[PDB]
Amino acid sequence: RPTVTVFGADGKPTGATEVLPKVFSAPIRPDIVKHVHTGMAKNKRQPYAV
Amino acid sequence: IKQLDAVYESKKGFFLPANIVSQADLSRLINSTEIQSVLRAPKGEARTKRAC
Amino acid sequence: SDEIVWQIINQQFCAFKLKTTKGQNFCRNEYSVSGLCNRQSCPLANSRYATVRQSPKGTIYLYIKTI
Amino acid sequence: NDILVPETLLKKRKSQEKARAERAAALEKRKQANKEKRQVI
Amino acid sequence: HFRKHWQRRVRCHFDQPGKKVTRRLARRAKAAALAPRPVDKLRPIVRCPTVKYNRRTRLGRGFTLEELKAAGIPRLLAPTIGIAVDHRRKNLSEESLAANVQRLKDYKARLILFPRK
Amino acid sequence: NKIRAELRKAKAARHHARMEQQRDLLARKRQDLDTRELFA
Amino acid sequence: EKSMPFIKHLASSDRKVRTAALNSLHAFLSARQVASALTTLDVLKLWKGLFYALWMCDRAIPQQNLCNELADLIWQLPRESVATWLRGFWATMAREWTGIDVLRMEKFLLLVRRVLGASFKWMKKGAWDQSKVDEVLGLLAEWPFSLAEEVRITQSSEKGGEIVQKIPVGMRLHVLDIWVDEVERVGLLNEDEEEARMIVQRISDMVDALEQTTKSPAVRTRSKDSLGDDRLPANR
Amino acid sequence: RKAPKSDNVYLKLLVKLYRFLARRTEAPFNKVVLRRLFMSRINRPPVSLSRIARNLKNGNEKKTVVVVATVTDDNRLLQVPKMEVAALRFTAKARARIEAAGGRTLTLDQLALEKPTGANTLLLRGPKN
RNA sequence: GGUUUUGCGCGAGUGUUUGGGUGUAAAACCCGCACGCGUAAAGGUGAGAGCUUCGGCGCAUCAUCGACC
Ligand SMILES: [Zn+2]
């Protein structure tokens, strides 16, 4: 799809449209997302020991 | 949405990756006029009748 | 990209998926013809779809989704 | 307002028609070969 | 290489995000005191010693006395206007001299000076 | 000392060889119907 | 350059916006001074937005009326620019043949049949205009029934660029299955007319050339079956 | 085998495509491409632009060179001939150098769409170890 | 810290996270010079997968004779 419609403050279409960027046509890779998200969620962690 | 093209261009050392598949709709790949014209006749059905 | 959408739903996660120990999986989507999580009856993976639903006034409607 | 048949469906029906006449012809070829085999055995 | 007690002398770095905040606050604390002035003093352009890094060029410690006098900056004024001064370094070639009295001349063009009282 | 000279010169020539390769990759990387322009 | 502010609206998600832009493209083609000066670069912009006009249309009976409306646009144009318009259609639909998914392919296969059906209708005035004959069939020799795998667009100069468009095999196999159906519809298969037998023959010789000189096995079997149909004058 | 080792959804999509083409076509090309899709990374070595060019040095030009691997660029090759390469992945320099010479880049699903039986193709494999 | 194998990104290059910038603040996002490892500093014949205008091309790899330092 070339364009995406821009909606107004009232919820109705304004009449202006924007072109969808190329990042929305990128590959969708669940294996990549899962691998990064597993290590990403570890990066906030705060150490514990006895 | 205007900036989305720019922020992904300004990322050095990275470009928008090329997919290994151009048409991800597999039904179009298989149920096409070009593929279906060249196939062999079907050797059987989905359910095989018990012979003996 | 209907095959890619099925690969995320079936293998990874679906919010409408009910898993039982009895061997069959169930679909909690209200727009499903059969409450089962197979490929032929997924409202999400199938861009073109049909279902039949009942309004509380008693009227039966045919819901058709096009791509 | 007639809603004509999809174009890809037309190619199925032509392919299905050739397959049915082929199966019908191969059935009669198989039947006549079986009749001759019962006499020869 | 764990023959000695490496258990008693192991140092982690969980203060790495916290030390960066302190270091950036120290640069902000310094710039509150020296409010119109830059944080860091001006430094000269020098050539790296060895044969491996002869072709590269880095910032030195301070400007030579001959570089300051050629630029027109008095020696006793330079530490008070943001110019670092090195008495140990010598020039030894006209290429080291000309690169630095261009740098000090470029510093003076971009410098705005306010009177004493 | 002529031996220790040419080990030092070899390491210097190895480092200068890498830096020339970095520049050459930069030089190589330097060397209306579109959808973002038609529907703009 | 030409002002074409309606190509943006042909891609809108609202049908009344798209209908207004399609009515606006009627006005652009009607203006005979601008329409006589349409370039190859100019028509490639139009058929791209016309492609997304059909790409967005929703239900079946809307799809058929739009396909017919896009077919009856050749009559709107002047005679000087009819050849480049059909060049735009075959070049655009070459660029996006694989990129259409399996559910939207039905309405675009109908669009090729309706446009090729309109081309054989246009060539009517020997009761057939020979100047129109070499244009439609010559453009049928360039994209569908070609002997080269690529078609060169525009001319090489200091003011021009470079567009080389491969003809996909799937386009060849579609025109092969619909070309007899279209020459029957407008009436080339009347056996009495000597001019009509000439036009049927020269495309029949054209596909027979594609039979013996292709390398795709898919084209080889599909072109043989198109020759072997009973409605053709030779096989009757 | 029974299943690809990969977790790419698109690589499983190509195996589904080439399981069908191996089953419903006599062509041995579809059988070997399917077997190379099941392979691991060390069993799919990359092919340089130079290795493709030296298998085109005979009258093998105007053949779709097909490689089930990643095509890499060779800086030791100064001139790249015109060629239609079909592969899994192209590196950024390799894709640009193929396109600058007037050549063309394919994916394996586009290859099966254009030549399903592998007609007039040229299969290449990368150097082992 | 070695090593083998699978998945993944990039590819003759690769590695943001010592550090700097920024922040909804131990997250996320960005990268200036270095640095580690690596790369750099075309022959015949015969088999051979695959293709084929059925004439023939011939991957990888092996073997045999050559070429050059
Ligand atoms: Zn489901």
> H33-39, long-range: CB within 8 Å, 24+ apart, which pairs?
H33/H66, H33/H68, H33/H108, H33/H118, H33/H123, H36/H68, H37/H4, H37/H11, H37/H68, H38/H1, H38/H4, H38/H5, H39/H68
Asked if C54 has any chain B CB less than 8 Å from its own CB, the reply is no
Coil vs helix vs strand at C50 = strand
* Chain F window 21-40, residues with Cβ within 7 A of nucleic strand I: 21, 25, 28
**Per the structure block, which two tokens stand in for G175?**
């025109």
Q: What are phi and psi of E113, to 5 degrees?
A: -115, 135
List CB contacts of G67: < 8 A, sequence separation 6 or more: G54, G107, G110, G111, G114
Residue D20: Cβ-neighbour burial (10 angstroms; 0-12, 13-18, 19+):
exposed
Q: Distance between CA atoms of G71 and G74, rounded to whole angstroms?
A: 7
Q: Distance between CA atoms of B19 and H77, rounded to whole angstroms?
A: 26
Of E62, E41, E46, residue with least CA distance to E99 = E46
Rg (CA), chain E: 20
Asked if B2 and A18 come within 8 Å (Cβ–Cβ), the reply is yes
Q: Locate tokens 């096989």: which residue?
A: G235
Which residue is nearest to the C1' sugar atom of I52, using CA?
A: H120
Beta bridge partners, H26, equal none
List CB contacts of E29: < 8 A, sequence separation 6 or more: none
How would you label E59-93 residue by residue, b for 16+ Cβ within 10 Å and e otherwise? ebebbbbebbebbebeeeebeeeebbbbeebebee
**Per the structure block, which two tokens stand in for H29?**
């090309």
> What's the helix, strand, coil split of chain H in %, to 5?
35, 20, 45
Q: Are A21 and B4 in contact (CB under 8 A)?
A: yes
List CB contacts (< 8 A) between D8 and chain B: 31, 33
In angstroms, what is the span from residue G69 Cα to ligand 1's centroid? 40
* Angle CA A11–A16–A22, to nearest 5: 105
Of G209, G210, G200, residue with least CA distance to G171 = G210
Q: Contact partners of A by the rule of 3+ C-beta pairs under 8 A?
A: B, C, E, F, G, H
Residue H125 CB lies within 7 Å of the nucleic strand I: yes
Handedness of CA G45, G51, G57, G62 (dihedral sign): positive
Helices and strands, number each (H, E), in chain B: 3, 0
Rg (CA), chain G: 18
A21: closest CA of chain H, how far (Å): 20
Q: Distance between CA atoms of G143 and G153, rounded to whole angstroms?
A: 12
**Which DSSP category does A1 fall into?**
-
Q: Are H116 and B38 in contact (CB under 8 A)?
A: yes
* Chain H window 4-33, residues with Cβ within 7 A of nucleic strand I: 5-8, 11, 27-29, 31-32
Method: cryo-EM
Residue E17 CB lies within 7 Å of the nucleic strand I: yes
Q: Contact partners of H by the rule of 3+ C-beta pairs under 8 A?
A: A, B, C, F, G
Q: Which helix (H) or strand (E) holds D12?
A: helix D7-40
Of C6, C1, G218, H15, residue with least CA distance to B28 = C1
**Per the structure block, which two tokens stand in for E99?**
């690169």
Of C32, A14, C64, A13, residue with least CA distance to G58 = C64
Q: Give the number of other Cβ atoms within 10 Å of residue G118's Cβ.
A: 21
List CB contacts (< 8 A) between B31 and chain G: 102
**Per the structure block, which two tokens stand in for G35?**
């329409």
Between CA H104 and C1' I65 the distance (Å) reads: 40
Asked if G45 has any chain C CB less than 8 Å from its own CB, the reply is no
Q: Distance between CA atoms of H115 and H109, rounded to whole angstroms?
A: 10
Q: Give the number of other Cβ atoms within 10 Å of residue G123's Cβ.
A: 20
Of E103, E27, E89, E99, residue with least CA distance to E60 = E89
Q: Distance between CA atoms of E73 and E36, rounded to whole angstroms?
A: 21
* Chain A window 2-41, residues with Cβ within 7 A of nucleic strand I: 31-32, 35, 40
Residue C14 annotated as binding site? no
Say whether the D–F interface has 3 or more Cβ pairs within 8 Å.
Answer: no
Asked if H116 has any chain B CB less than 8 Å from its own CB, the reply is yes
H92: closest CA of chain F, how far (Å): 10
Measured between CA atoms, the residue of chain E closest to residue A47 is E14
List CB contacts (< 8 A) between D11 and chain G: 177
Angle, in degrees to the nearest 10, between helices D7-40 and G169-186: 100
Q: Are H55 and H124 in contact (CB under 8 A)?
A: yes
Q: Locate tokens 């996909």: which residue?
A: G168
